[PDB]
Design a protein around this nucleic acid. Structure first.
Lengths: 131, 122, 48, 31
RNA sequence: CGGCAAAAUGCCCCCGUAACUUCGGGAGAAGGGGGACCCACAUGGCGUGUAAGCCUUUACGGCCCAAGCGUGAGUGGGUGGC
RNA sequence: ACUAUAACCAUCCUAAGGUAGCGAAAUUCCUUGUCGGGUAAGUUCCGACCUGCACGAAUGGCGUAACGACUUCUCAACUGUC
RNA sequence: AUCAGCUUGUUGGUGGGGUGAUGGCCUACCAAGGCGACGACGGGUAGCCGGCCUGAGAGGGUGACCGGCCACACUGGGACUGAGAUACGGCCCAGACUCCUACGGGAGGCAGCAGUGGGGAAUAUUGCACAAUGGGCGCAAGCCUGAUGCAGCGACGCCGCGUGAGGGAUGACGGCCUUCGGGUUGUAAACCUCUUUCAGCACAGACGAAGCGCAAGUGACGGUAUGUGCAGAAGAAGGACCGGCCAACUACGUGCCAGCAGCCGCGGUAAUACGUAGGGUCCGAGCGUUGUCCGGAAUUACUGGGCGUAAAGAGCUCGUAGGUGGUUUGUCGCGUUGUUCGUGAAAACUCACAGCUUAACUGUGGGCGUGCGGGCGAUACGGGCAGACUAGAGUACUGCAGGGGAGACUGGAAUUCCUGGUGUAGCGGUGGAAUGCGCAGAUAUCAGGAGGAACACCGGUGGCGAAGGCGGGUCUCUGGGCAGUAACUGACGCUGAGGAGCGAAAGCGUGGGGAGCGAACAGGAUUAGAUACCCUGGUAGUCCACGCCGUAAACGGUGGGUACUAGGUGUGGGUUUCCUUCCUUGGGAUCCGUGCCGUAGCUAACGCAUUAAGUACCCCGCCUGGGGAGUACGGCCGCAAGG
RNA sequence: UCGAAGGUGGGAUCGGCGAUUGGGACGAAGUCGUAACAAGGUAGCCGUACCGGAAGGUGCGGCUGGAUCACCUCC
């Protein structure tokens, strides 16, 4: 059965990115929408919107490609997963691509990046890495 | 394996083979020569290797190799043996230390003297 | 690093024996009331 | 995979079965 | 010729019992502990069962039952002998 | 390839040349065979060897728990068996 | 777990007792509990820690010195005194050992400091002082202190210093090599100056003592450190290695020897690998060897590995404990996270500073002490609690395909045999023959009869089943799958350690049956020999019933579930729009299977590739060089084979 | 009463020796044979059963990790 919706979202993104699709659709949830918000604000995806589906609602994500058709996402990794979950304090927050990437952290203040969490002095669960 | 499989069974390291079990944790042992004889090595090489049968103080009967050119070992001769393998001989893991106890340093040696128990010329 | 759930049995002391099997009860530590008996029943949060 | 490994294993197994056959009564009487 | 013949063990109640096995056995395996008398618990427990009492389709009825009679087993203390 | 035996070969005869298993045996003469155990000392006893005078598969072979006023050997206890 | 059961004051209660104190700590009675696969109960090993070593870190190994806690004091029990007792230099008893005895009886305990013997590869003086610090008694002076402060011995370790510095040549002698020219040792040497560190001699000489003492003095170290003079380069260098890893090569000697070696491998008269000499390199009061631990080793992979063919997917399912879980609302603040308080001894480590002539070393002040306990804040995620939803899952209804399974009955062809005709002299078999059958009438041919087993064509890379597997026909009973509608429940899902069931063939038991085939076994042939291949016979078995076994190249050599990632083309089952004859694989769309080719991607390669070996998440099984060995021992299972 | 040591008894469990006996590893050149690798001269291997001096042979079922399929006339 489906165990990790977040990892399934990340793999849909990765598979669409490898296939040079301009479009990727998936069932909607609040957490996935928040991750889409962070990805868009950090400039990794072009734009996202949420339609409605036959049963519930869908999430639609536009993949950003450069003029010469080079992908704007180099990698997508799921860090904390069901089973082994990863939490980090405000001081040992992870670095992605030596700081060139972004780590998404679920704090009690919401979804933040590694830099935002470090600046606000908070910790939480390390959801994923984007670079 | 899965993380759950790890927490259930864990990782077991490989066991280490004990070397020179006759020494019993000592760098050297003293023994008495049960029999002093000679033997022939494995096929690719050929010589008359000099080997002594030593009964150590750890109550283990062990076959030891005699380095150097000439030796003065006979029956009932107290020797000090160390660890060291000789590739040619199949089951020899010990060498007799020259210049300790009954065994004498080699004669007319001028290089690597400390490894054969030969004093400096006066 | 995984979170592991472990279970442990303690022996509590209730005077009137109002607690059946399956009830969420609350305990508080106390001085040894016998061998192996170190807990005192405070109250039953919810019966079952 | 080479059939050499199967051949080595089968020779070992065949020899063991032959040994078992040769000492059936001796084993039964000793156990 | 050979433990032949003798001697020895022997009961009851507890504890505890090996290889092997065809799972039934072997087994009473082997090995060990107590045993007399008096008193108390004890007008106890158990069996029986009369009067009393209760009940009924009332009789050659059922239940219960002090009294009486019979009787173990245990526990504690004491007594005597090799 | 020391010596020893012979996995192997040749040859004669037969209906076929004894397989499994066991073997100094209720079968073994030589013989108290040889080795090991048990004893201070063991021609008996137990284990094994195989050179089976002259074992051998329903005149069954090899084992086998339980059983035996059967035969054999050893130990404890017990004793006028001594 | 090649140790699955353990426990009877044992688990709880009541009354007593006992203790400084609670408590089966003890006791009487009562109840029958308590622990255990989250590993009880056994077996083995072990003092624990701050720390130490290694490592980039995680981790691994360790518990020497110093510091804290525990345990013990010849072995085993016991109490006494006391505020406090494992009472090391106390007591009682028993025991072993050693000693004295007038034989009646007595004495002793180095795991305190030195020391002795023994064991061992191996570890020191039967030293000085209470001057300093700590401790006991005393009002105090003071006394005691093998605690302690010092010294002695051992390159055992770390650190520091010296063994000389400047000048000195067509570069002396000697050595060694040589192309016989010369080159190298080599600025090295010889010589000319300079300086004396450290040692040696002489002189002076401490701090440690704002101490102790109401006496006049008081330092064990120690006349040491140290300071100043004197003389003179004068008294001061070895070890390993030099084929590659891995800095550093020539000559002579020897010849598969003697020997070397960590691995690869070197010794066969011209060895840069043996031995020795020149030269060189690396270290240096050291240099090597052995032993042990970490690293390299991502080679147990949390960080940070794998399982088609290299070792590795259980033969396949069901399912227990466990692990894990769709969308959404509220709440808790258990995890998570922020902050604060207490603690995390000192020493050690690290940063900075200071003091020893520097360093080692020592002191001071931060950090560290990755944790735990209390309060306060947050609610995204995980979890709990209370709800809601339908996309997962399941039910309902309507259809559909099928060698799915079990039982009963039954059909035809062919083989074999039996009976009776006709009919003769061969038949059969092979690469070629012979055993064999037949002349007592065989083979052939025709008719009739008995019996068993397997089901031609359909029939395939086609269907069904979890796998093993399943097709002559009919009937009875029965399992699953798919499609459509979406009526219903509303997360009821997934995986599954152990466990249970099923599981080809062979084999085993009991009872039947037995045509063909056919291990074993007989002959014949081939062969040098044929315990085989080939031929003729042929018993178990193959078949049925009821049970055991529990293995296979049980293979797709590919565990299950889920989502996503170009296409093209066959074929099986079902729904539906449009060409429309609507006959037609017309064509399309969609769901579920089953093949082939092929992108991206993956792989050591072969190859896989929407039926993944691609991209990911959950759960399970398994691997850790090859043999020994899937074997021995133990155990469980089985009638046995054996698993 | 409890109680160390001692005595008696029947068992556990860990090792050593053991006459005889099984296999394993290695050993230039011994003996016997040709089993496998090329279709290895009977394709090989897996399970099982029987048999054989030995490798091995044969039966039943299974797998491909088995080689060769020339010419092939109509279109």
């Amino acid at each position: 059965t489906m165990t990790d919706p977040i990892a399934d979202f990340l793999t849909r993104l990765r598979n669409a990115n490898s296939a040079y699709h301009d479009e990727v659709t998936l069932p909607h949830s609040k957490l996935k929408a928040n991750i889409a918000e962070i990805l868009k604000r950090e400039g990794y995806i072009s734009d996202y919107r949420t339609e409605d589906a036959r049963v519930g609602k869908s999430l639609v994500v536009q993949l950003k490609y450069g003029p010469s058709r080079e992908r704007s996402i180099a990698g997508l990794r799921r860090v904390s997963k069901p089973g082994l979950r990863v939490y980090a304090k405000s001081t040992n927050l992870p670095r992605v691509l030596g700081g060139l990437g972004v780590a998404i952290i679920s704090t009690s203040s919401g979804l933040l990046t590694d830099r935002q969490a470090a600046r606000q002095g908070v910790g939480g669960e390390v959801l994923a890495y984007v670079w | 394996p899965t993380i759950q499989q790890l927490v259930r069974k864990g990782r077991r390291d490989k066991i280490a083979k004990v070397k020179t079990a006759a020494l019993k944790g000592s760098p050297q042992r003293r023994g008495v020569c049960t029999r002093v004889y000679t033997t022939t090595p494995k096929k690719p090489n050929s010589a008359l290797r000099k080997v002594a049968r030593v009964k150590l103080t750890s109550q283990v009967e062990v076959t030891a190799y005699i380095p150097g050119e000439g030796h003065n070992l006979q029956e009932h001769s107290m020797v000090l043996v160390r660890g060291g393998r000789v590739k040619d001989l199949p089951g020899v893991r010990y060498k007799i230390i020259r210049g300790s106890l009954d065994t004498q340093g080699v004669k007319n040696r001028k290089q690597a003297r400390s490894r054969y128990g030969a004093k400096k010329e006066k | 690093g995984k979170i592991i759930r472990t279970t442990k049995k303690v022996k509590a002391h209730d005077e009137n024996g109002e607690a059946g099997i399956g009830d969420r009860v609350s305990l508080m530590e106390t001085r040894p009331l016998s061998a192996t008996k170190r807990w005192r029943l405070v109250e039953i949060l919810e019966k079952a | 995979g080479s059939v050499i490994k199967k051949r080595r294993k089968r020779m070992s197994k065949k020899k063991h079965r032959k040994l078992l056959r040769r000492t059936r009564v001796q084993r039964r009487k000793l156990g």
